[PDB]
Write a protein that binds this ligand. Structure first.
Ligand code: AKE
Ligand code: AKE
Ligand code: MG
Ligand code: MG
Ligand code: MG
Ligand code: MG
Ligand code: MG
Ligand code: MG
Lengths: 664, 664
DNA sequence: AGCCGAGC
DNA sequence: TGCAGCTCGGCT
DNA sequence: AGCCGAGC
DNA sequence: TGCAGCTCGGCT
């Protein structure tokens, strides 16, 4: 007692304790449905207590963490659990205020994950309790066919719980999930009350684990996770010419693209897409209009999403050309068409902004690469040559990145000895934030700590919001020692960067590990090249259909102004039959679109009466002719040519955009 | 002396030292402004300048309970940071020895709500330490920084007229004087409208700055007589109409939509709450909810306080909305502008006085407004009666689905009773609570005390539903007879009084007025709405007239084309435009009519070629005649006839909608 | 130990 | 995801 | 000793 | 308006 949000059971703590159920709900809303579902009657045997958000994995959480956790302590107090005390006999169980815990989560994967973390919590502290049948679940009277009993049934349950939640079973989880993904491919080519913990883990929780990967680990093809892809898709559909509140953009994405989660995560994703400070995006697809955070705090200083604004970068449709949309496979969420399975950008975006995310079994980490360097390599491969090797590269980073080994790099800031008493620091290594360096490095150097001596006499700061300048004073003696020991080393201006986890989803939807970024580059290249061929086939078909369509329209207009044909007072039916008999083609553009998965002459008869006038007749001829020349000008271009055009246009604008950024 | 457990404070380096009285504490409006002051001070400023942010409006300490004052976080925080002590005169220069800061600089938004926070801060210091105002303790920083001194206004205390100004603004004893104060302001501004420093005194801040807030408080809090809306509410409707959603929208998303579309200059949470309020339909809320509660919008159980978050509930227009606010009337409204953007009208003009239906209520400065709900059908019937020149029946308050009783004690005085019935000589039954008594509150504040304590009842059970109230109460046969001896409704507090002597509203001209009876409100509404039916008729005769002319010309052209009487084939634009003039075709009749508060033939020449076909020629002729009849039919009707048509349509959909509610 | 970020 | 309190006037 | 609601 | 912590993996 004395715990808020708890609706303790009436008979709890008394002689009916072991016949009392604590209902633990995912969220306050689920709690209040449990409350109205009990009525007056249920309050004797049933208590209810909400949890907000994911809970601690206690199995390898530190002791400070476990002792300080609100939720876990609240559950312990409410139920009467005691650490170390096993529940073997029946005199033990007389110490509990409740006899059962009934977990009521959303019937979604994240719901399953909470069920799992709760199960994990009991199993790790009181495994004996699991055997007595302590845990139940409420799936969403009928109210008894909704209840399911978790059954312990031997040591294959201890193995399954540990497979999901032990820091020592990461490799096991990879195998586990590899088997799962392999099975579900096989099932895709063909077709399609007690619950053991093993069956829960291996038939329900694994769906969360998989979904966690699908949402946290990006695609090779466009560098996007599904949430980020929804943000772009929504922005492309909107086509905003002026900025939008981020919070408002989030609701739009939720609605236009069937995003089924809390909008806060969306707003945060949008902020992460727009950020443009040293160590975030080499090319932000979204414009950071307002305070989106700075290198002073790693963006942690962004303003609230209801006071910041964004819109597409002019580089966005240059990187993801609208016409290629006709080539994408757009997904469906209950009969609404949403974002595509991936976009197909002109260079590999996954390398530019350096994908990163954490799933189950695997994680992704990729550093940034230089956009012009990637353009040049793509041009090289278009020439049949081999791509040059690429080092990680961060836009506006003044330091150095040197190869140390396979997928390992030294990232160094800049420190120059000015006089015998003064060093100057003008760059921090990538992802070292200014405030953090000040507090964790320079302060301890000025003040000493309990464990370290002072090393400097003073420091002064001269940063701008995008640059770094520390002026540090020392004694001639201490500077001399610092040099001998290595300035970057002493000043923590040198960090390593290790990339042995380049895990991405390939274009088929398969999770692969890539050993080098040249492998990533080459797989991207082969795919993008074939999509340029698909674009050509599509444009020839479409432009050809438009040519035909203009020819028929222009022929009618001429046949009309010469008295060769009349529609005046002719009936619909006779007009159609006259047109057929004179070899006018049914809507060619519609016919073409149709052949991509009664005769229609509306493209002709929907023309305005203006069409018959002198200038409009001339203008219609010039357009008919111009389309013909446009069909042919396209046929003369190779997929390589089309690509090289896109790349040239992109670089022109990239130069202009980066130039305006250095002035502003 | 330092300061410890005040996390958001940036203390001046020299604060609390010998150089205390040269230190300045900057109080900001919100954390946002706190960070801009922190940057503005840089590293230099951190010595003499302190920064502490206040979130929200602060306590009015003049006439506040002793408890409120002691428990309030901001006031107590300011006191610790500055080192003030209650009941100490800061008259000499020795008394100032105990302050950690010598002055406070207030930094707020330069809007009316900022002025209010300034005033409340001034009120705080003034009421506790007048002494300090003489020494010039308070200053302010005007804002849209290294040019600080031009931005820095000092407050001057010049005499007991400064005391009177502050007291007039913030004393519970000077409500009447505030009425007079604002009446002058509204009058002077009505006159000016027809026709055409460094050391601010308190009197001038109050009478030239704060009064601007007090007035804005009224403009946003007191409803209009015409449509019963406040500006926030009006903007929400205007947006809904403009949007015309055919399916539900998330409340949070609609709020963002309103802000964008109607230039709503405030936080969106307030707007989300307003939206929820507009949509509620439980007993005691709206009689006709103009927005639909799709999701959990609160219940009579908690007075709606149990509504879900605005991001998990949906809304759209009631089918009754455009029946009450007919679209055609939009053409008669004066729409407002917010700097090159057309926004909501100054009012909508509904077909019955909505201000009576859902019972307007708000609190301003000097004035407040309360109005109870009235029955929709009774109002329709009084409108009909007045249309027939009869007398309007007097009206009693009516709450949709209220099962109890509302009795008139006298003008604007009513007694509202719930329902209590004797079941047996041991048992009573409560089946209705008085209007605006919420179920959980009644249980907690009435029944519980009666069960516990000198205890009057022996037990009680609950059989509520979401929308109905049922308590069964068990009593001792002696106690019941006693309870029944006094009033049963009295003992069980099932009778409340409702008193309506503050029916203050903005009239159609924008003047604030106190109405004595609803009959007065009804008359004034009535004279204005009848007059707008006149306008709608004139407007419709004119526009339909233009449309008729437009169709006449179009039909004419078509008939002349299909007969050879006119040809456009291969004619230049000029020759064709000049020809049409010569034949007396009229430049776009509708365009011309609209402009009326070279020739344009596009309305003829933009017609499709289909127009010349048999079926289309007949359809055009039918349409032309249809419009002919429509103009004529309308010309014969009175404004009063039009009004009866709208009312009849409104009542038919009300019967349908309300029927469907009493089944779902 | 704590970052990275898309979920609750 | 939910948590946190004030203004202003009339009324009880 | 607090509701009502549009603001911060 | 801003406040509150946890997962999952790789690597510092
Ligand atoms: O529980 C949540 C939560 C739930 C659903 C959506 C969002 C949140 C949430 O943001 C949150 C907290 N936010 C603080 C800043 N981090 C930004 C990321 O959104 C803080 C605490 C918190 N829950 C507390 C209990 N969890 C502790 C583990 O047992 C939430
Ligand atoms: O300061 C605010 C605040 C500021 C701007 C917008 C909203 C709020 C706000 O909601 C708020 C609180 N919300 C509780 C729910 N009530 C309904 C209104 O949304 C609670 C406290 C609070 N500020 C605390 C300081 N005021 C203390 C007076 O001395 C705010
Ligand atoms: Mg869920
Ligand atoms: Mg990135
Ligand atoms: Mg403001
Ligand atoms: Mg109301
Ligand atoms: Mg009061
Ligand atoms: Mg970890």
């Amino acid at each position: 007692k004395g715990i808020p949000k708890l609706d303790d059971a009436n008979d709890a703590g008394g002689k009916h304790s072991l016949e009392c159920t604590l209902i633990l709900t995912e969220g306050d809303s689920a709690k209040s449905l449990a409350v109205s579902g009990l009525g007056v009657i249920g309050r004797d045997r049933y208590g209810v207590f909400p949890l907000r958000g994911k809970i601690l994995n206690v199995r390898e959480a530190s002791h400070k963490q476990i002792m300080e956790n609100a939720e876990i302590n609240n559950i312990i107090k409410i139920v009467g659990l005691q650490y170390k005390k096993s529940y073997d006999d029946a005199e033990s169980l007389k110490t509990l205020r409740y006899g059962k815990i009934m977990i009521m989560t959303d019937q979604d994967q994240d719901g399953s994950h909470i069920k799992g973390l709760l199960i994990n919590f009991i199993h790790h502290n009181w495994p004996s309790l699991l055997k007595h049948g302590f845990l139940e679940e409420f799936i969403t009277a009928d109210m008894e066919r909704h209840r399911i009993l978790f059954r312990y049934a031997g040591p294959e349950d201890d193995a399954a719980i540990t497979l999901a939640f032990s820091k020592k079973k990461i490799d096991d989880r990879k195998e586990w999930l590899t088997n799962f993904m392999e099975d579900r491919r096989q099932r895709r080519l063909h077709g399609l009350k007690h619950l053991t913990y093993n069956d829960f883990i291996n038939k329900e929780l694994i769906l969360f684990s998989n979904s966690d990967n699908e949402r946290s680990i990006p695609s090779l093809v466009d560098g996007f996770k599904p949430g980020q892809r929804k943000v772009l898709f929504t922005c492309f559909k909107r086509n905003d010419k002026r900025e939008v509140k981020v919070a408002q953009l989030a609701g739009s994405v939720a609605e236009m693209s069937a995003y089924h989660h809390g909008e806060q995560a969306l707003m945060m994703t949008i902020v992460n897409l727009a950020q443009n400070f040293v160590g975030s995006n080499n090319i932000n697809l979204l414009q950071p209009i307002g305070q989106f955070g700075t290198r002073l705090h790693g963006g942690k200083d962004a303003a609230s999403p209801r006071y910041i604004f964004t819109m597409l970068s002019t580089l966005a449709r240059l990187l993801f050309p609208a016409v290629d949309d006709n080539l994408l496979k757009f997904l469906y969420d209950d009969n609404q068409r949403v974002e595509p399975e991936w976009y197909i950008p002109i260079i590999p975006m996954v390398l530019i902004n350096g994908a990163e995310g954490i799933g189950t079994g695997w994680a992704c980490k990729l550093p940034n690469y230089d956009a012009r360097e990637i353009v040049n390599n793509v041009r090289r491969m278009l020439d049949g040559l081999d791509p040059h090797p690429m080092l990680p590269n961060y836009k506006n980073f003044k330091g150095t990145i040197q190869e140390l080994g396979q997928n390992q790099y030294a990232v160094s800031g800049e420190i120059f000895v000015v006089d015998r008493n003064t060093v100057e620091i003008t760059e921090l290594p990538v992802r070292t934030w200014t405030q953090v360096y000040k507090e964790q490095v320079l302060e301890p150097m000025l003040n000493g700590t309990d464990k370290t001596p002072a090393l400097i006499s003073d420091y002064k700061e001269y940063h701008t919001d995008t640059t770094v300048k520390f002026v540090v004073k020392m004694t001639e003696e201490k500077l001399a020692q610092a040099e001998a020991a290595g300035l970057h080393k002493v000043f923590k201006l040198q960090t390593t960067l290790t990339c042995n986890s380049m895990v991405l989803f390939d274009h088929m939807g398969c999770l692969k590990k890539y050993e080098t970024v040249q492998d990533i580059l080459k797989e991207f290249f082969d795919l993008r090249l074939s999509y340029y061929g698909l674009r050509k086939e599509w444009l020839v078909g479409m432009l050809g259909a438009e040519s035909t369509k203009l020819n028929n329209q222009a022929r009618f207009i001429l046949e009309k102004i010469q008295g060769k044909i009349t529609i005046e007072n002719r009936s619909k039916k006779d007009l159609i039959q006259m047109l057929v008999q004179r070899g006018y083609e049914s809507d060619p553009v519609k016919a073409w679109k149709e052949a991509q998965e009664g005769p229609d002459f509306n493209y002709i008869l929907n023309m305005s009466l203006w069409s018959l006038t002198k200038e409009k007749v001339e203008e219609l001829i010039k357009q008919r002719d111009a389309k013909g020349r446009e069909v042919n000008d396209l046929k003369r271009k190779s997929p390589s040519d089309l690509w090289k055009e896109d790349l040239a246009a992109f670089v022109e604008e990239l130069d202009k955009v980066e130039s305006q950024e250095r002035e502003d």
